[PDB]
Each structure stands twice: as C-alpha cells, then as structure tokens.
Amino acid sequence: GASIQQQATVMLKIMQDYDWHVFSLVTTIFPGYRDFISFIKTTVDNSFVGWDMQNVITLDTSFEDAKTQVQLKKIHSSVILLYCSKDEAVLILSEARSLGLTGYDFFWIVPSLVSGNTELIPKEFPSGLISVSYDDWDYSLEARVR
Amino acid sequence: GASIQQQATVMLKIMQDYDWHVFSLVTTIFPGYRDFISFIKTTVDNSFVGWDMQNVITLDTSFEDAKTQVQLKKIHSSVILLYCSKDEAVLILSEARSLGLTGYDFFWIVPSLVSGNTELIPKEFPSGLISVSYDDWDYSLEARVR
C-alpha cells in the first residue's frame, strides 16, 4: 500500500483532470499534517496548472465554534481538502452542514485515513464524498500472499 | 424632542460622513420596528450613496443561541444597526462578544431608546458604542420652560 504523498499526488491528478483549480486546505491536529503541507507546497510550485490555493485552515482543539467558525467562514472555494481522523470528521461535517457549506459545488476530498470501516458509515457524510483507499476488492488476499 | 425617523436620518447622515457604506440591520421584537424598517427602505432608495445593505436580522424571542446564532453569524459587515430595549441589549452584546463580532471594525449603532440612565451603564457595552439622544446638558430645564 501507498503512503500519504502518493495518495496526495493521485488526488491532485484527479483535481487536474476536472479543472477544479480553486481550493483551500483544511488540516486537523492529527499527526503527520506538516509533511502533507510541505509536500503540497512543493508539488504545486512545479506544476503546469498554476493552482489557486486559499490560506490553510488549521484546527486547534475540538472546535468551540467561537473562533474556529471565523476561519471556517472564510472558506469560499468549491474544492476543499480535509485531513482528519474519522471521529473528528463527523463533528466537522455536521458543523459545516450547519454553516451551509454543504452545497453541491462545495466538494470535499479526504485521504484513506478518514474512510474507516466499509460497514461503519456515518450519516453526516454527504452522498458524494471524495475518498481514495488502497482497498481493491477485485484482488483477494490469496493474490496478495502469492 | 425628535421621533425615531428624525434620529434615523441623523444616523444615516453620520454614516455617510464617514463613508461606511456596508452595513446590515438588526431588529428585536420591540414594538415600532416595522416603521423603522419602512423608513430606512424609503430613505436608501432616494439617496446619492447607494448603500450596501445586508439582510435584516430579526429576533424571535430571548435568543436560544440555537437558530438565532445562525443569523448572527451571517452578519459580515463593519457597521451594524441595532434596535432594542436596554434589557435585551446586555444579552445580545454579551452574545456577540462571545461570538467574536466585537472587533474594532465591528461598529455598533443604536438609537436613544437603548441608552437609558446616564448613571446606569452596563459593562457589556464596548467602549465606543454609537448613540444619539436628545439630552442636551448645555441647556437647562429653565431654558426649556422659558
């Protein structure tokens, strides 16, 4: 399976193939966020697209909805990148749905980390969340061990 | 002394003289609000300024901070107009200070109604509230009766 950087490259490829050149960056206190930030910064500056990046949204704690909502309001793009654990995702998505940022154009992209069990599916995930995970169900574990 | 409409005209003159052309409208359930709304609507449409007006904020009851905060968040202007009694002003101002809308650029304008006793001064009023009242202390009651 792949690391965070390979999946981030795949995500930016997917974004390019649909010409969604305006986005932001939302990161939680989950460890390993700064490496993701640095990889994105290095990837954008050597690209043919010239992406429009809004200022990075960083959470501090479980959002009090007092000063965190101030940063959440300034998110004006259509594509949003989120890097969080599964437990915080339900809270943040309910918060955004209350803020009204859950429109059709407000796409949401998350790595394989937030997509947990296939059976466990929170109701606060809008129908159309963007996720990429290495779980290929066409290839069984027998092929893997072979 | 003057009515609500004359004081509203004076307030809009004050706003024009500082070129604060972006504002909203916050009204409570205090009686006489609809006349103020109609007067403002008629005054703006025949003006040289072309004011930017956000949607009017109307309170329903003592704010539960459940759906009222939804409307309070959408207030994004620098100039805010408030029409309320003195008892509700402390509650609403504490609510806004908790929401963080108590910045230096977030000016607050209120009529003579909310400014009660000169001695009675709540602590929740930020230093710099905008108020206009006909209490002219340079002219005594002797001149008035004369």
Curated annotation (Swiss-Prot), chains A, B:
Subcellular location: Cell projection, Dendritic spine; Cell membrane; Synapse; Postsynaptic cell membrane
Disruption phenotype: Mutant mice appear grossly normal and are fertile. NMDA channel currents are decreased in mutant brain slices. Contrary to wild-type, where tetanic stimulation leads to a strong long-term increase in synaptic strength, only modest long-term synaptic potentiation is seen in mutant mice. Mossy fiber granule cells from mutant mice present a decrease of the slow component of the excitatory postsynaptic current. The slow component of the excitatory postsynaptic current is nearly abolished in mossy fiber cells from mice lacking both Grin2a and Grin2c.
Domain of life: Eukaryota
Binding-site residues, Zn(2+): 119, 135
Tissue expression: Detected in striatum. Detected in forbrain. Detected in cerebellum (at protein level). Detected in brain cortex, piriform cortex, hippocampus, caudate-putamen, dentate gyrus and granule cell layer.
Function field: Component of N-methyl-D-aspartate (NMDA) receptors (NMDARs) that function as heterotetrameric, ligand-gated cation channels with high calcium permeability and voltage-dependent block by Mg(2+). NMDARs participate in synaptic plasticity for learning and memory formation by contributing to the slow phase of excitatory postsynaptic current, long-term synaptic potentiation, and learning.
Quaternary state and interactors: Heterotetramer. Forms heterotetrameric channels composed of two GluN1/zeta subunits (GRIN1), and two identical GluN2/epsilon subunits (GRIN2A, GRIN2B, GRIN2C or GRIN2D) or GluN3 subunits (GRIN3A or GRIN3B) (in vitro). Can also form heterotetrameric channels that contain at least two GluN1 subunits and at least two different GluN2 subunits (or a combination of one GluN2 and one GluN3 subunits) (in vitro). In vivo, the subunit composition may depend on the expression levels of the different subunits. Found in a complex with GRIN1, GRIN3A and PPP2CB. Found in a complex with GRIN1 and GRIN3B.
Family: Belongs to the glutamate-gated ion channel (TC 1.A.10.1) family. NR2A/GRIN2A subfamily.
Entry note about domains: Contains an N-terminal domain, a ligand-binding domain and a transmembrane domain. Agonist binding to the extracellular ligand-binding domains triggers channel gating. A hydrophobic region that gives rise to the prediction of a transmembrane span does not cross the membrane, but is part of a discontinuously helical region that dips into the membrane and is probably part of the pore and of the selectivity filter.
Name assigned to this protein: Glutamate receptor ionotropic, NMDA 2A
Organism (species): Mus musculus (Mouse)
